[PDB]
A paper describes a structure:
The tandem-repeat galectins, of which [name] is a member, contain two distinct CRDs at their N- and C-termini, connected by a variable-length linker region that is susceptible to proteolytic degradation. The overall fold of human galectin-4N is the conserved galectin β-sandwich fold comprising two β-sheets, F1–F5 and S1–S6, of which the concave side of the β-sandwich (S1–S6) contains the saccharide-binding site. As with other galectin CRDs, the amino acids forming the binding sub-sites C and D are conserved, while those that construct the A, B and E sub-sites are slightly different, granting galectin-4N its unique binding specificity. To investigate the interaction between human galectin-4N and its natural saccharide ligands, we have determined the crystal structures of human galectin-4N in complex with glycerol (the cryoprotectant), lactose, lactose-3′-sulfate (3′SuL), and 2′-fucosyllactose (2′FL) at 1.70–2.00 Å resolution.
The galectin-4N-glycerol complex was determined at 2.00 Å resolution. The cryo-protectant glycerol was able to soak into the binding site of the apo-crystal. The binding sites of all 4 of the monomers displayed clear density for the bound glycerol molecule. The binding of the glycerol molecule is not influenced by crystallographic contacts in any of the 4 monomers. The oxygen atoms of the glycerol molecule are found in positions that mimic galactose O4′, O5′ and O6′ and interact with the conserved residues His63, Asn65, Arg67, Asn77 and Glu87. The carbon atoms of the glycerol molecule mimic the cyclic ring of galactose and make a van der Waals interaction with Trp84. In addition to the glycerol molecule, a water molecule is found in interaction distance of Arg67 and Glu87 residues and mimics the conserved interaction observed between lactose C3 hydroxyl and these two protein residues. In our human galectin-4N-glycerol complex structure, the binding site of galectin-4N is pre-organised to interact with saccharides. Importantly, in the human galectin-4N-glycerol structure, the interaction between Asp69 and Arg45 still forms in the absence of a natural saccharide ligand. Due to the weak electron density and the lack of proper coordination, we have assigned water molecules at these positions for the galectin-4N-glycerol, galectin-4N-3′SuL and galectin-4N-2′FL complex structures, despite the high concentration of Na+ ions in the crystallisation condition.
Numbering used by the authors: 15 to 152
Write the structure that this text describes.
Amino acid sequence: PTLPYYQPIPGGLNVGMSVYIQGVASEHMKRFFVNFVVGQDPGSDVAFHFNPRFDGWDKVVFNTLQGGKWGSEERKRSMPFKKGAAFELVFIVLAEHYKVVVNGNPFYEYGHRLPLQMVTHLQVDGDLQLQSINFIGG
């Protein structure tokens, strides 16, 4: 797949589903993001925004965009990615939260703010190369 990636999730998002992303973080990475998006119209809500950042104290930001407004940011001050390194990024969709697993290590649990069944698309962009995106357990 090529970037930017913005594709429908087959059968929409459901509990039990996993999203498995294999990529390589850019040698020159500042940020990238993975968005679980409600539709493909301009100004679509983002149920879940997953945003690793190397600017400043290395961290990952988690948020929701609803009605044009970013919510209260959640943050984990730990960077499971590495500039120039291949990664395995898994989102396990559970009833209570998205469980994020990076290179086999449980990383974060992001509680649902928008109903997960409203999600139609996965969007991925930023400072990385994409090797594959797979939807499992749909």
